[PDB]
């Protein structure tokens, strides 16, 4: 068990610290769930009595895209995927050194393809909310402003000892399970009008999504009689790598109608035109989430086609497809997996955020706004969660 002591009163000079934090999640330590196994060997139980000391008159410049704390979580989830889904073939590139003598030719074609073969057991998979807690001597601040602007200074700074519920869910084009906005859908981006930084859009209302596969692959009709030998029962008849999702159109249309109102105020009365993405990797062109080793690659072309104009006011069939050979977001290379499993898999998920890029240009005339879906950089996935916090070290005179 762990234990730390409070600070009754301290307002000294603040200095940005880069110390090593310890996780703290509510595990179980008995099930065969992987996140319960990982939290048992490296995490501690959650704080039963948290304390948030509110600072009346205190301000600070919370820069968020230069936060070194999200660089630690990104190196703590890569340590979980090497203990959760062991790939059958882990193909990764490996080059060494080839240069000539910038002034001399830079033809580097020496690269080795190292392959690793491991056992592939299909294991359970479900995220668990964790709490990152500060070590001895440091403190974690937290703004309470309902807008917070991204890298802008707030005024309602309060200090804590552990963060809120953070799930390690890995997804693209739609931020899954996590925290919601307070009062209004806000947008966050490091720099607008430079069309390189992704725009994080956080929602204030949870849009639900149900992703399941129908159990009709195996046949239940019996040809009891002349046949019953070749076409015998339990024979696969359907595609075992096909699924479908559903989105409540009457509820999702409200939340998207609030996103375009924020853009109009920000970008001075333009024609918001959403579009499908411009191509690339199948983890970028399509949606990508995980449910028990089932890596749903959901076609979202019937989700971002619609163009917009002013005066704005049921079951969208989202076609998904399970692909075995997937790209690894952690490092260059691929990872071939195992065949899918026997039974109904249901992903009764949430939608809390939205990752959007921007297509600006000067060849195109004065007014257009193209917002293609982006994401894929998993550091940007948890910058949408660790935006309120900051690790600062306060020296003690004692």
């Amino acid at each position: 068990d762990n234990l730390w002591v409070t600070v009754y009163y301290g307002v000294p000079v603040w200095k940005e610290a880069t110390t090593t934090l310890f996780c703290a999640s509510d595990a179980k330590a008995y099930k065969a769930e992987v996140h319960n196994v990982w939290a048992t060997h490296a995490c501690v139980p959650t704080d039963p009595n948290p304390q948030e000391i509110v600072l009346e008159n205190v301000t600070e410049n919370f820069n968020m895209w230069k936060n070194n704390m999200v660089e630690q979580m990104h190196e703590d989830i890569i340590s979980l995927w090497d203990q959760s889904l062991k790939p059958c073939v882990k193909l990764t590139p490996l080059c060494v050194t080839l240069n000539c003598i910038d002034n001399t030719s830079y033809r580097l074609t020496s690269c080795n393809t190292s392959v690793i073969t491991q056992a592939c057991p299909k294991v359970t998979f479900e995220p668990i909310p964790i709490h990152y807690c500060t070590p001895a001597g440091y403190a974690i601040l937290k703004c309470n402003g309902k807008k917070f602007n991204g890298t802008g200074p707030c005024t309602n700074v309060s200090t804590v000892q552990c963060t809120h519920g953070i799930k390690p869910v890995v997804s693209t084009q739609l931020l899954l399970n996590g925290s919601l906005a307070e009062e209004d859908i806000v947008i966050r981006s490091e720099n607008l009008t430079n069309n390189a930084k992704t725009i994080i859009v956080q929602l204030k209302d949870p849009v639900d999504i149900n992703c399941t596969r129908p159990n009709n692959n195996t046949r239940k009709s019996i040809h009891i009689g002349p046949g019953r030998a070749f076409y015998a029962t339990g024979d696969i008849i359907g595609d075992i790598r096909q699924a479908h999702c559903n989105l409540s159109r009457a509820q999702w249309n409200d939340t998207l109608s609030k996103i375009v109102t924020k853009l109009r105020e920000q970008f001075e009365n333009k024609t918001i035109k959403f579009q499908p993405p411009s191509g690339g990797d199948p983890e970028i062109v399509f949606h990508s989430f995980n449910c028990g080793g089932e890596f749903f690659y959901c076609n979202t072309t019937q989700l971002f086609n619609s163009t917009w104009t002013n005066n704005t006011e049921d079951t969208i069939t989202l076609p998904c497809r399970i692909k075995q050979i997937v790209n690894m977001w952690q490092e260059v290379g691929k990872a071939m997996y195992a065949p899918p499993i026997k039974g109904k898999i249901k992903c009764s998920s949430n939608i809390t955020g939205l990752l959007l890029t921007r297509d600006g240009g000067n060849n195109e005339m004065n007014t257009t706004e193209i917002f293609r879906p982006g994401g894929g950089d998993m550091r940007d996935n948890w910058r949408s969660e660790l935006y309120k916090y900051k690790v600062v070290r306060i020296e003690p005179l004692g």
């Binding site: 069309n195 390189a196 411009s278 193209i370």
Partner: protein
């Protein structure tokens, strides 16, 4: 910034520099600020441009510090400058593509004019600097045209373009359809069978060929005697040409313009015109024939030479035991009071006997 060159279709390598070695985010934008490629974690995002199915990048080099830009099927309109974006920096690069070709594919006969077609991008000043195996480093503007193109000027010519101290090499496809002679002269005597032969060099194509041989007889102004023949595949067939010369032509591409007996009126100049198509054009070649007529009129003899004779030649009539009984520079020399012997007539040209004809006198 540096500059590279394209070769109208191949790939080009445009690299950036990064000394951080952390696989940080990169981008690829033109002068019009249009995304083409970009880093997304460890993933590749083909940006919204006109180079979607063309731009490529080597992912194995991303953990080194070098980020290439591989663009296949280089067109002329793709010439633009591209800036990099790593560690908040703008590594500006430049790119230029151009091309060069001809218009006549295979019908480049011996003595046919040459035409080029340079495809240079707008906003640039190229300079044609070719290289020929005959030592012709012909330099000029952008469009180059040469009147001379023969069988000895075929081959892949190395034409390079110097611009901003950069140059790349190219090749030129030349198919030369030529003859192997400018002017043949055949020296025969009265009675001897005359043979003509003018070769070509194994070109295979569709319906292409038809031509004719014009003739100018000596002192016979009655023109319009020729022979017209058609060409289609391995095979030679006369269409129809009719007239005083019994010209028989062979059935194979080594054309044998055969003439039965060298009659004295069958001598003079001539032009052989061959015409192929798919790219029309006409070849030309000179044909000549010289006829000697040695026949005694009575107990005194007289010999004459017909044909395109030179004003420098000689003529001699000797009884082959002693020396020449007469030597003149004409075409009709006579000998009165000959003797017994095998009389020889000598046609020559500054050193060397061309024609020889034997005849006997009975006393």
């Amino acid at each position: 910034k540096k500059v590279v060159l394209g070769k109208k279709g191949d790939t080009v390598e445009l690299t950036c520099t990064a000394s951080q070695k952390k696989s940080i985010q990169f981008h690829w934008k033109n002068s019009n600020q249009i995304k083409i490629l970009g880093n997304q974690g460890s993933f590749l995002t083909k940006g919204p441009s006109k180079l979607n199915d063309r731009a490529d990048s080597r992912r194995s080099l991303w953990d080194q510090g070098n980020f290439p830009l591989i663009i296949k099927n280089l067109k002329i309109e793709d010439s633009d400058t591209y800036i990099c974006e790593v560690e908040d920096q703008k590594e500006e690069v430049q790119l230029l593509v151009f091309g060069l070709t001809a218009n006549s594919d295979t019908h480049l006969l011996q003595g046919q004019s040459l035409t080029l077609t340079l495809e240079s991008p707008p906003g640039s000043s190229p300079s044609v600097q070719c290289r020929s195996p005959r030592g012709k480093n012909i330099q000029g503007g952008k469009t180059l045209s040469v009147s001379q193109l023969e069988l000895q000027d075929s081959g892949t010519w190395t034409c390079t373009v110097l611009q901003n101290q950069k140059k790349v090499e190219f090749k030129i496809d030349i198919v030369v359809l030529a003859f192997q002679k400018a002017s043949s002269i055949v020296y025969k005597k009265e009675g001897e069978q005359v043979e003509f032969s003018f070769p070509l060099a194994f070109t295979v194509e569709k319906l292409t060929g038809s031509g004719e041989l014009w003739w100018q007889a000596e002192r016979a102004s009655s023109s319009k005697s020729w022979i017209t023949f058609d060409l289609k595949n391995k095979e030679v067939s006369v269409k129809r040409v009719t007239q005083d010369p019994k010209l028989q032509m062979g059935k194979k591409l080594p054309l044998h313009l055969t003439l039965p007996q060298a009659l004295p009126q069958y001598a003079g100049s001539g032009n052989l015109t061959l015409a192929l198509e798919a790219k029309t054009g006409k070849l030309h070649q000179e044909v000549n024939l010289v006829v000697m007529r040695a026949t005694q009129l009575q107990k005194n003899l007289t010999c004459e030479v017909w044909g395109p004779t030179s004003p420098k030649l000689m003529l001699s009539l000797k009884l082959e035991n002693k020396e020449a009984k007469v030597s003149k520079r004409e075409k009709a020399v006579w000998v009165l009071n000959p003797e017994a012997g095998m009389w020889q007539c000598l046609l020559s040209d500054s050193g060397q006997v061309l024609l020889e004809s034997n005849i006997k006198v009975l006393p």
